[PDB]
Design a protein around this nucleic acid. Structure first.
Lengths: 119, 228, 155
RNA sequence: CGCGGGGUGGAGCAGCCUGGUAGCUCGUCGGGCUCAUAACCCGAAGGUCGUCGGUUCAAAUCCGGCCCCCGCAACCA
RNA sequence: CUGGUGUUGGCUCUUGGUCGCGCCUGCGUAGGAUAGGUGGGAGCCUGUGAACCCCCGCCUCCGGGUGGGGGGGAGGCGCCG
């Protein structure tokens, strides 16, 4: 309903799928998208091309929502991530700025044995 | 804008909540017919029935005492002495048995299409798939069937009309023109209101007549009183 | 070809229309060195293009090898015990070899008597764009630009 | 038994409602393709729209009788 | 255990399913577009601003329908095809 031109776009890029949310200046979802939202399923979600599409789809579904300029914040790794940022730009939006806010424990919870190879 | 300047001025002489019997409607529709041409008097209404079943789907015919004023070109698909029977009474096209061979590529709408009881085996495949829901169906309940085909054509050229119920549940049919005085319009609109009362389906519950509107081609309508 | 980059074999200009492309198409039309009945056929085709369409056969032939050249395709290439079908634009040389070869193959799946009328009727359809040979061009690109997920392995 | 929803290729199902549109998908099958198969893609055999009558110049449709499944709450001398 | 009522009173906020209307929308395909349906219609919409250029509310099966303000001056829509 409400329509505000200034925004904030989130890129949660993992390994098995890159996902992005677009919030308002307060950080409240206006709409979101992802490698799954698009036609893709399975592994080919983690792929970059998927990331792009997700980003694009997110953009448009954010555009016709009264959007014009967003503040991008990525989190995670995986191919998709990169493409995702570049995608938001050359897509019709206004990438006001990009930040790299990946969560990192100053050594907290012990990771699964997969992530603990870093013995 | 949304409306017009020749249309909206007509929205000053009629109150929707003020029920104008067919006399304050037939006197006020004489001040709604402002057109280069001579309008009509579209008579509409919403009946108390169910248009999705076949016990209350009203239909039939009814001759209005003064007529319409707009000439209808009636034709025929006779069989026997009913070829010269529709040509002595007055018909544009008549008994040619199967003149369906001309109208199978083109045609710029005349007005009517009648027939008789014995040409029912192939008067369904030749021109049964064209005029279909184009209200020209030789429906016997519509009044376009019978050996008395030239007798049913001297009343549809001199008054009589057809009111059919559609999918939604209402009943339309014109009852005159706009140049017809307060006597020719009001009396006529009374011979069509019996056609909805007398043809009133059986399984229809409640006050059959929920409404009965009467306006003018390009003009505003009046929620006219039911019986008067 | 494990050392040098193979080596592009050079054709011999067509004796009637000049173009090397021409003779190449014939080389495919051919079977068992029967370069004569091979050649023969190609032309007879043109004689139909000439009578069926007041268009110069060459002008038609060229435009039929074009409307068929596949701009991209899928090729297998494993990376981690998985056979993805990666897509990548195709060499301008192979881009010809395919079209040529297919125009030929297709022209033999039609219910036509003499071979002549086959290569002819076909070509005329490759130009218009509606052919069985033109077909693969479409069904070979529908493939890629579909698996465009694995694009990122463009070796 | 009173109420009401619809039977459609081998199966289901949008179309009905708001008249004239055999449409969606898998099996089937010829073929393109690939190491192999699925996916992808062209072409096709398969629908009396349960049935029977009328309304219809035309009815899968509106529809009266109706075969049968589903849903339904009650009741059970 | 539980719904309705009685003992049972004050003060604002929120929001349905009905029914009072004021009002707003619709598209398979072929087709210039986005044609719910029947009846009427050969005629009306503009000097209370029309073809179009700019901006926003709204709706979306995203092609585009819709309606007001503000540039601008006289052009639209349909029968028929």
């Amino acid at each position: 309903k409400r329509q505000v031109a200034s925004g904030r776009a989130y890129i949660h890029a993992s390994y098995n799928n890159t996902i992005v949310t677009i919030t308002d200046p307060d950080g409240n979802p206006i709409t979101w998208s992802s490698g799954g939202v698009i036609g893709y399923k399975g592994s080919r979600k983690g792929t970059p091309y998927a990331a792009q599409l997700a980003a694009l789809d997110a953009a448009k579904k954010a555009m016709a929502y009264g959007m014009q300029s967003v503040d991008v914040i990525v989190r995670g790794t995986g191919a998709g991530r990169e493409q995702a940022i570049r995608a938001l730009q050359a897509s019709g939006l206004q990438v006001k700025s990009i930040v790299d806010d990946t969560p990192v424990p100053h050594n907290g919870c012990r990771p699964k044995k997969k992530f603990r190879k870093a013995s | 804008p949304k409306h017009g300047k020749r249309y909206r001025a007509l929205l000053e002489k009629v109150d929707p909540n003020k029920i104008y019997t067919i006399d304050e409607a037939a006197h006020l529709v004489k001040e709604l017919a402002t057109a280069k041409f001579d309008e009509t008097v579209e008579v509409h209404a919403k009946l108390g029935i169910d248009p999705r079943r076949s016990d209350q789907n009203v239909r039939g015919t009814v001759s209005l005492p003064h007529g319409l004023g707009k000439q209808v070109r009636v034709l025929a698909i006779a069989k026997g002495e009913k070829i010269k029977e529709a040509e002595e009474a007055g018909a544009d096209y008549v008994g040619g048995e199967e003149i369906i061979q001309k109208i199978l590529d083109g045609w710029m709408d005349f007005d009517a299409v009648v027939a008789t009881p014995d040409v029912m085996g192939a008067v369904g495949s030749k021109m049964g798939r064209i005029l279909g829901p184009r209200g020209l169906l030789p429906n016997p309940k519509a009044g376009t069937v019978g050996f008395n085909i030239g007798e049913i054509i001297r009343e549809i050229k001199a008054g009589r009309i057809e009111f059919r119920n559609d999918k939604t549940g209402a009943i339309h049919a014109p009852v005159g023109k706009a140049s017809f005085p307060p006597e020719k319009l009001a009396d006529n609109i009374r011979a069509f209101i019996r056609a909805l009362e007398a043809h009133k389906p059986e399984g229809a519950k409640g006050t059959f007549l929920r409404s009965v509107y009467v306006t003018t081609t390009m003009g505003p309508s009046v929620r006219i009183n039911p019986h008067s | 070809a494990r050392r040098r980059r193979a080596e592009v074999r050079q054709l011999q200009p067509d004796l009637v229309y000049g173009d090397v492309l021409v003779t190449a198409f014939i080389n495919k039309i051919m079977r068992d060195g029967k370069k004569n009945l091979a050649a023969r056929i190609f032309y007879d085709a043109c004689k139909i293009i000439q009578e069926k369409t007041g268009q110069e056969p060459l002008k038609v032939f060229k435009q039929a090898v074009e409307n068929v050249k596949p701009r991209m395709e899928v090729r297998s290439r494993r990376v981690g015990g998985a056979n993805y079908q990666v897509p990548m634009e195709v060499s301008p040389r192979r881009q010809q070899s395919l079209a040529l070869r297919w125009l030929v193959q297709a022209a033999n799946q039609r219910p036509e008597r003499r071979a002549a009328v086959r290569i002819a009727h076909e070509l005329m359809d490759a130009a218009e764009g509606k052919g069985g040979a033109v077909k693969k061009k479409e069904d070979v690109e529908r493939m890629a630009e579909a698996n465009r997920a694995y694009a990122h392995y463009r070796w």
